[PDB]
Design a protein around this nucleic acid. Structure first.
Ligand code: MG
Ligand code: MG
Ligand code: MG
Ligand code: MG
Ligand code: MG
Ligand code: MG
Ligand code: MG
Ligand code: MG
Lengths: 70, 300, 159, 165
RNA sequence: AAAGCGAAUGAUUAGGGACCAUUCUCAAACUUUAAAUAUGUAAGAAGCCCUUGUUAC
RNA sequence: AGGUGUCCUAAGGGGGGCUCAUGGAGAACAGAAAUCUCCAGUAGAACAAAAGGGUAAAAGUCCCCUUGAUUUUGAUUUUCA
RNA sequence: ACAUACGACCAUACCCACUGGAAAACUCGGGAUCCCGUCCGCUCUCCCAUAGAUAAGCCAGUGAGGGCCAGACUAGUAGUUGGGUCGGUGACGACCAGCGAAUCCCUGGUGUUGUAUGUU
RNA sequence: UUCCUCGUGGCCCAAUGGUCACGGCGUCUGGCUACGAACCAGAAGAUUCCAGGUUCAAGUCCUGGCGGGGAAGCCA
């Protein structure tokens, strides 16, 4: 918070500092992220994550998310 | 270093399919839009097309008119219908096209009620002749006019397409016409050989091939023309066979006569068709199969 | 302005939609037009012969002359302080019958049927269309669904 | 049933550097070998390093079908000592090779028509390929009817009694 | 106008698996979409239905 | 942000056959670029010349035949009084 | 109801892969004298309809397939017409009378139909 | 700032869109000389300033950038 407070002095106009309810850069609430992680609907792919959908090849989905079907 | 997928999903998303008959490769819409287009100051006057198609083992001739909601068949004539008139062999040769064209022309005039007005060339002599307006008490009456539609068939000299078109014109149907593509027409010297043309009309060209085969290769003659010799029809019996074939069409164009036992209705085979038809799965049927597949691969 | 030729500014008007360009459907050639019909001009860019100017694109007019593959249309063009009759020779490929006239023609035929039916039956009927009228008295039952009490929601969530 | 491999055609290609007497001589050797009139091939575009110009005749080739295509192929494999690299077989079922000193096929050598090399390329199909070449109702051959690399090499070994490595 | 770029064209950040699946941000002379306001025409007697007449179309 | 004062007996007219740019795989010299074969390939090519529309059994490309780039004056459109 | 010829709308019809197809038809098919056209009867053209086959074309079913089509959500949100001596230094914003979208995720479906001739 | 012009071997320069090209000096080798110059025989040497576009092909034709030079910058 102090880092962004110092930086906003370099910009014209008003800037606000807000705490995000989401987990990191993912657009999911902290409660939802825990639920998806427990269900195995997440695939750790680098700095970000990918989700499991009901559409697509069954083998590809089950191979990429083995825990979501056990 | 490594190529990319041409298709991926944007190719499918932006792909625009051709017309269904174009994808199936059956219609030439470039020629169709010109065959089917009536002058707007001819408000409701159909343009009749002579559809000539040559499938294997068959010839299909139709008089087709065009409508916004589809096409209408004015009359039809099939080569397999010539069996009633005595034509058993060579149902898809050049002469069978002439007889089918003659059969269709007689059917059209009978449907129109003009059979006694236009008779065309009663005895075929292979002469370039146009169906002219008949002279009656009221004066001149213009003949029924139809246009040839070859489809995707090549329009080369001596093609069977012009055989049906020649047969229809001799029947009494006016067709815009030219002799450049008849057999015996010499491109270098623009004359039409009538003796060659009337030779083709009566199945002549088949006869010398049977004659040449008999002299040179008896075994090849046996294989090609086994059905001819089995039914005892020699080379000289061809031109006579087509002689009364034309006459029988002139006298009766709607002769059913010959039939193959047994006769039948329409309903009970519709019941037969439904018995052989497979049915799509339902939502729960699809869902259950997915659950089974998951279980099998998880345990595997 | 600097450039004022035909087809100027018709980059989008005379184009064709995303996935319906290429071959032209043959139903356009099979439509039949009489003198007195009311048609809508919609220039098709796939055919560059016999177009109409961009001012007449999207306009409506009455057919006055029918020739082979094109028709004449009388269109009233607003020019400053007056209207001017404009006779446009446009191919049948750029036009289509107006459904508003067809909807009127089914109504005029229908009005004759009701008037004929009413006169034979023996009671008067109304032929003029009437605009929507104020609602009359009605009673609403709450035996199944009762009213739901809803109140404004708090700002609460910042995002 | 009707899944038997056949020699659909055999194309003999001779790509000489330039056009003139040398290319005309290459026509003679192709005509003598196959018995058919050959056709010259023009250059797509000019390139300086190769010494060719645009719309310039460069190569000459013929297409041979039938038993005469079979007998040319066996003569070419005789020069190759019935030996082919496994790389010579494309995955589409086609294969081919190249030879030098066209005299090795049995043609009588003559000064004036010197030493020429050839490329022999063979097209392999099945008795259903017309559905993709006919003018009316043209379509695509089914996936299970297509000839793979493994199928043509198996056919080549069991029929020509040659060795591939 | 808005919207879009895990859709074409163009611009553009980052990691990951072997080019592929993702990710951040854009377009007066880009776009699959797509408003509000404005905009053309029709709402009939010079009309509609039945029979029938004229013509060199 | 650009263009014109030109160019074409074909690059005009009609008809027929074919499919392009590109990518993958393969063949003596031959390689990143020569020519040949197959597969995929919605136009990502070409259409004299700026840019924008349009076009796939074509409007592109090759082949065959021609001169409607002719005669007669009218009606209509755009700039517009 | 199925097949064939000609169609209409022109992906719910397309692309990939797997499986199956009774009757007839479609098709692959056999031959190169004549008509005809090619470097090559590959294509086109002509003759055969006997032999063989559903291997392919074609049709049907399957795929938590790609796409396409429709709905829901996004959302009464973005945007916009008229109004005030409304707020704000301003950028802009709210309200009054109205209109009112489009993504991402989510779900469902995978051609309909006309003429004519036939089909066990 | 505006307009115009030029950029080529180590140096100074010329150039017909159709062969990466020319002339002189310079450099290299051999000969003559005791030796060096001069002289006589022969060789080698260019990312045509750079980045794009047209055409089958660009140093040549077109656009922009870099470096240099010339001309104009007036009435008050
Ligand atoms: Mg045609
Ligand atoms: Mg438009
Ligand atoms: Mg013109
Ligand atoms: Mg915007
Ligand atoms: Mg959008
Ligand atoms: Mg983008
Ligand atoms: Mg309105
Ligand atoms: Mg054409």
């Amino acid at each position: 918070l102090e880092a962004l407070r110092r930086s906003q002095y370099k910009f014209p106009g008003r800037q606000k500092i807000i705490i995000s309810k989401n987990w990191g850069f993912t657009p999911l609430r902290r409660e939802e992220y825990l639920e998806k992680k427990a269900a195995g609907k997440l695939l750790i792919d680098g700095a970000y994550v990918q989700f499991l959908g009901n559409r697509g090849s069954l083998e590809r989905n089950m191979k990429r998310f083995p825990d979501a079907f056990a | 270093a490594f190529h990319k997928l041409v298709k991926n999903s944007a190719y499918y998303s932006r792909f625009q399919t051709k017309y269904k008959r174009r994808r199936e490769g059956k219609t030439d819409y470039y020629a169709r839009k010109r065959l089917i287009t009536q002058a707007k100051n001819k408000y409701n006057a159909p343009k009749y097309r002579l559809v000539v198609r040559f499938t294997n083992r068959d010839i299909i001739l139709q008089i087709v008119s065009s409508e916004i909601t589809g096409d209408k068949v004015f009359a039809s004539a099939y080569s397999h219908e010539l069996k009633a008139y005595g034509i058993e062999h060579g149902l898809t040769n050049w002469a069978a096209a002439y007889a089918t064209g003659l059969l269709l022309a007689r059917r059209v005039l009978k449907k129109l009620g003009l059979d006694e007005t236009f008779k065309g060339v009663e005895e075929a002599d292979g002469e370039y002749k146009l169906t002219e307006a008949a002279e009656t008490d009221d004066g001149e009456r213009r003949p029924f006019k139809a246009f040839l539609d070859v489809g995707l068939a090549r329009t080369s000299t001596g093609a069977r397409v012009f055989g049906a078109m020649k047969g229809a014109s001799d029947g009494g149907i006016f067709i815009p016409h030219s002799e450049n593509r008849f057999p015996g027409y010499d491109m270098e010297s623009e004359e039409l050989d009538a003796e060659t043309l009337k030779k083709y009309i009566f199945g002549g060209h088949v006869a010398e091939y049977m004659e040449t085969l008999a002299d040179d290769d008896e075994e090849r003659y046996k294989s090609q023309f086994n059905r001819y010799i089995e039914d005892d029809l020699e080379a000289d019996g061809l031109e006579d066979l087509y002689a009364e074939a034309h006459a029988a069409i002139r006298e009766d164009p709607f002769k059913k006569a010959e039939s193959e036992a047994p006769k039948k209705t329409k309903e009970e085979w519709k019941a037969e068709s439904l018995k052989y038809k497979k049915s799509k799965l339902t939502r729960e049927q699809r869902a259950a199969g997915v659950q089974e597949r998951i279980a099998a691969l998880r345990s595997e | 302005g600097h450039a004022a030729g035909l087809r100027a500014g018709t980059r989008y008007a005379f184009s064709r939609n995303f996935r319906e360009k290429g071959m032209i459907r043959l139903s356009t050639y099979l439509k039949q037009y009489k003198v007195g019909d009311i048609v809508d001009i919609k220039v098709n860019g796939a055919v560059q012969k016999g177009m109409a100017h961009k001012v007449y694109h999207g306009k409506t007019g009455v057919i006055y002359n029918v020739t082979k593959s094109a028709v004449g249309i009388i269109i009233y063009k607003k020019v400053k302080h007056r209207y001017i009759e404009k006779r446009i020779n446009v191919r049948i490929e750029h036009i289509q019958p107006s459904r508003s006239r067809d909807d009127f023609l089914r109504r005029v035929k229908q009005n004759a049927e009701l008037k004929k039916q009413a006169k034979a039956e023996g009671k008067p009927v109304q032929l003029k269309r009437q605009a929507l009228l104020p609602r009359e008295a009605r009673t609403i039952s709450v035996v199944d669904n009762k009213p739901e009490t809803v109140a404004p929601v708090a700002y609460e969530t910042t995002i | 049933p009707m899944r038997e491999l056949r020699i659909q055609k055999l194309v003999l290609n001779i790509c000489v550097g330039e056009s003139g007497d040398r290319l005309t001589r290459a026509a003679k050797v192709l005509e003598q070998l196959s018995g058919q009139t050959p056709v010259y091939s023009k250059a797509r575009y000019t390139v300086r390093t190769f010494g060719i110009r645009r719309n310039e005749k460069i190569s000459v080739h013929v297409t041979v079908r039938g038993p005469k295509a079979e007998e040319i192929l066996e003569r070419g494999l005789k020069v190759k000592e019935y030996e082919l690299r496994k790389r010579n077989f494309s995955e589409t079922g086609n294969f081919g090779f190249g030879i030098s000193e066209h005299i090795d096929l049995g043609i009588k050598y003559d000064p004036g028509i010197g030493i020429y090399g050839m490329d022999f390329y063979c097209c392999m199909t099945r008795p259903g390929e017309r559905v993709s070449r006919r003018r009316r109702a043209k379509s695509r051959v089914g996936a299970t009817h297509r000839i793979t690399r493994d199928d043509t090499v198996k056919w080549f070994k069991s029929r020509f009694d040659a060795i591939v490595r």
